[PDB]
Amino acid sequence: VNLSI
Amino acid sequence: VNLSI
Amino acid sequence: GAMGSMERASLIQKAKLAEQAERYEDMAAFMKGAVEKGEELSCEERNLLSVAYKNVVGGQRAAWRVLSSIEQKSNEGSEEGPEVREYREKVETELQGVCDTVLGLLDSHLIKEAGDAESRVFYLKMKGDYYRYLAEVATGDDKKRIIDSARSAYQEAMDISKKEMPPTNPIRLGLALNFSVFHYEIANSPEEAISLAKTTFDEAMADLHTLSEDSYKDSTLIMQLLRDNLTLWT
Amino acid sequence: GAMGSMERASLIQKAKLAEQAERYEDMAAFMKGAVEKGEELSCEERNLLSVAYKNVVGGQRAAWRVLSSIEQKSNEGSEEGPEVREYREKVETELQGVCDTVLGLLDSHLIKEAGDAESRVFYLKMKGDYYRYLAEVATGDDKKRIIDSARSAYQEAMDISKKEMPPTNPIRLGLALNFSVFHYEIANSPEEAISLAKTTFDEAMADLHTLSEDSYKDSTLIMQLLRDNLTLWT
Numbered sequence: 001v002n003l004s005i
Numbered sequence: 006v007n008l009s010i
Numbered sequence: 011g012a013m014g015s016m017e018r019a020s021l022i023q024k025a026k027l028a029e030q031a032e033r034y035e036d037m038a039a040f041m042k043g044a045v046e047k048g049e050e051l052s053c054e055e056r057n058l059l060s061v062a063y064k065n066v067v068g069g070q071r072a073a074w075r076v077l078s079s080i081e082q083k084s085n086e087g088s089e090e091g092p093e094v095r096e097y098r099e100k101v102e103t104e105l106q107g108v109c110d111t112v113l114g115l116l117d118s119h120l121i122k123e124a125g126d127a128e129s130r131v132f133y134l135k136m137k138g139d140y141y142r143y144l145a146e147v148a149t150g151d152d153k154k155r156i157i158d159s160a161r162s163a164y165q166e167a168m169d170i171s172k173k174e175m176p177p178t179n180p181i182r183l184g185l186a187l188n189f190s191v192f193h194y195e196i197a198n199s200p201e202e203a204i205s206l207a208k209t210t211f212d213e214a215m216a217d218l219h220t221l222s223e224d225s226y227k228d229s230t231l232i233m234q235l236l237r238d239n240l241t242l243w244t
Numbered sequence: 245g246a247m248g249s250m251e252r253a254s255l256i257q258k259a260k261l262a263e264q265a266e267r268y269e270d271m272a273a274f275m276k277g278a279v280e281k282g283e284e285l286s287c288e289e290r291n292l293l294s295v296a297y298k299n300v301v302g303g304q305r306a307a308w309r310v311l312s313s314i315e316q317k318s319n320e321g322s323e324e325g326p327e328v329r330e331y332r333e334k335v336e337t338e339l340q341g342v343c344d345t346v347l348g349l350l351d352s353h354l355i356k357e358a359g360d361a362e363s364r365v366f367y368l369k370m371k372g373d374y375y376r377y378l379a380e381v382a383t384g385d386d387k388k389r390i391i392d393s394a395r396s397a398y399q400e401a402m403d404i405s406k407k408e409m410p411p412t413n414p415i416r417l418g419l420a421l422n423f424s425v426f427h428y429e430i431a432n433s434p435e436e437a438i439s440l441a442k443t444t445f446d447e448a449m450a451d452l453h454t455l456s457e458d459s460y461k462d463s464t465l466i467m468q469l470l471r472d473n474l475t476l477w478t
């Protein structure tokens with residue numbers, strides 16, 4: 001999973 | 006906390 | 011009936027999809043439509059119904075408790091407006107609406123058409139649960155009556171389950187767990203709550219020897235909840 | 245405007261209450277009403293807006309992914325009806341509706357009225373985020389155009405942030421993190437994603453010596469997300 005904010 | 010189901 | 015144009019089987023299928031997606035508001039709407047088709051629910055379909063509304067009202071209750079705590083602090087050295095009360099009332103009214111909807115389904119017509127003990131106790135447990143949730147937020151002239159509607163529903167279920175079901179049946183155990191929580195925090199009867207939880211646990215323990223392995227996982231889980239409440243209560 | 249009769253200050257107060265109660269749909273509706281009062285948002289109020297819709301769309305996306313995976317399996321030795329597609333489309337349309345609502349707010353009139361760099365980049369990041377969420381589910385003739393609307397929004401924000409903000413500014417870092425995720429999984433440009441994450445991380449590292457202690461907790465958190473993506477990507 002790719003982490004975003 | 007009281008546990009219920 | 012927004013679900014009136016959808017096949018019963020499709021509603022059940024979509025309720026299971028919603029469960030996998032943790033879309034519990036959708037899940038409850040699908041199962042409401044399924045109930046309104048007029049046919050009785052199967053064992054598996056009853057579980058979809060209860061899980062859906064349990065999660066919907068569960069989130070509403072947790073949010074109501076957060077707001078009611080903030081409200082309580084605001085009414086202690088605390089500075090004054092109406093916003094906290096207003097938003098607490100908003101969540102509360104939405105919570106009461108869901109409870110009213112569930113109770114209406116049980117009354118039209120799941121409870122009256124249920125003949126087998128397992129389904130009858132199941133639905134009467136639900137009726138007690140959702141009257142209990144209404145009692146948690148009740149403060150007016152209706153509190154006492156709401157409390158007795160929960161007691162009456164729980165009690166009939168108890169009488170049936172003790173007559174028709176073995177002590178380790180998961181529905182009988184779950185009913186007893188929730189009826190004991192009712193005693194403890196709604197009905198101001200902690201001694202009754204403790205006596206019920208212990209007799210319930212003890213009589214299931216002595217009946218485990220009759221069960222096949224790996225076929226009472228749900229009963230085990232509930233027996234652990236009874237043991238946890240007892241540890242907290244004693 | 246269902247919130248048109250409520251004071252702006254009351255909407256902000258109730259958005260914070262909703263945040264504490266993790267009632268993010270309510271939180272988003274309150275902040276939508278606050279934006280529609282026509283006044284610019286403060287730094288703290290912008291954060292309420294983004295957190296609210298981030299959580300709403302975040303849950304929709306996770307549910308869409310669960311259903312799309314089930315749908316993909318159903319189209320592989322798999323037995324056939326339309327229900328999975330129908331419910332996936334239902335969640336998808338609800339997701340697109342929320343993205344359309346956020347983008348409309350940014351366009352009317354948060355972006356055009358924002359003069360300070362911090363607010364302008366903030367809103368342009370949001371515009372890129374919600375076009376990216378639309379791109380995640382796009383499959384028709386619009387996918388390419390949706391992708392470029394995200395790129396264009398992200399790119400303008402990048403140009404402003406590199407001109408007007410220090411490398412450790414949390415908004416500049418958060419923009420860079422999300423623009424790199426855009427490159428990696430939307431724009432089919434993993435090398436660009438990796439180059440951006442590393443230059444972003446490295447230049448913030450070399451600028452930490454300018455910051456006071458315990459005043460860049462958010463920048464630290466985002467630098468860790470960049471390091472985590474790099475570990476996954478390399």
Ligand SMILES: C=CC(C)(C)OC[C@H]1O[C@H](O[C@@H]2C3=C([C@H](C)COC(C)=O)C[C@H](O)[C@]3(C)/C=C3/[C@@H](COC)CC[C@H]3[C@@H](C)[C@H]2O)[C@H](O)[C@@H](OC(C)=O)[C@@H]1O
Pocket residue numbers: 010029057058060061064132133135136180181183184185226227228229231232
């Ligand atoms: C949402 C439906 C799914 C996930 C498919 O099933 C939920 C669960 O449905 C069954 O379990 C029921 C059941 C629960 C079990 C205690 C869960 O057990 C385990 C191992 O997780 C929790 C659920 O909420 C449910 C349906 C609720 C009731 C409760 C209803 O009152 C009106 C009374 C007690 C309990 C009974 C009905 C349980 O039999 C099954 O026996 C469970 O399977 C196992 C291994 O025990 C399954 O996890």
Ligand SMILES: C=CC(C)(C)OC[C@H]1O[C@H](O[C@@H]2C3=C([C@H](C)COC(C)=O)C[C@H](O)[C@]3(C)/C=C3/[C@@H](COC)CC[C@H]3[C@@H](C)[C@H]2O)[C@H](O)[C@@H](OC(C)=O)[C@@H]1O
Pocket residue numbers: 005263291292294295298366367369370414415417418419460461462463465466
């Ligand atoms: C919901 C509002 C509350 C909980 C009050 O604040 C959320 C957070 O709001 C601020 O943090 C922002 C912010 C986040 C920080 C990374 C959180 O940091 C910590 C220590 O938790 C996450 C939030 O989603 C938020 C508002 C989002 C943005 C993001 C917006 O793009 C459009 C860009 C990067 C990031 C910026 C705006 C952060 O500054 C604050 O600096 C945070 O406080 C600390 C100690 O860092 C606070 O947790």
Ligand SMILES: [Cl-]
Pocket residue numbers: 005294295298
């Ligand atoms: Cl964000």
Ligand SMILES: [Cl-]
Pocket residue numbers: 010060061064
């Ligand atoms: Cl239940």
Ligand SMILES: [Cl-]
Pocket residue numbers: 096097100258
């Ligand atoms: Cl309100």
Ligand SMILES: [Cl-]
Pocket residue numbers: 024330331334
């Ligand atoms: Cl659907």
Ligand SMILES: [Mg+2]
Pocket residue numbers: 004005302
């Ligand atoms: Mg995310």
Ligand SMILES: [Mg+2]
Pocket residue numbers: 009010068
């Ligand atoms: Mg509970």
Ligand SMILES: [Mg+2]
Pocket residue numbers: 017018
């Ligand atoms: Mg039919």
Ligand SMILES: [Mg+2]
Pocket residue numbers: 099102103
């Ligand atoms: Mg009220």
Ligand SMILES: [Mg+2]
Pocket residue numbers: 050123124125
């Ligand atoms: Mg019958």
Ligand SMILES: [Mg+2]
Pocket residue numbers: 251252
């Ligand atoms: Mg005013």
Ligand SMILES: [Mg+2]
Pocket residue numbers: 333336337
């Ligand atoms: Mg579509």
Ligand SMILES: [Mg+2]
Pocket residue numbers: 284357358359
């Ligand atoms: Mg301005």
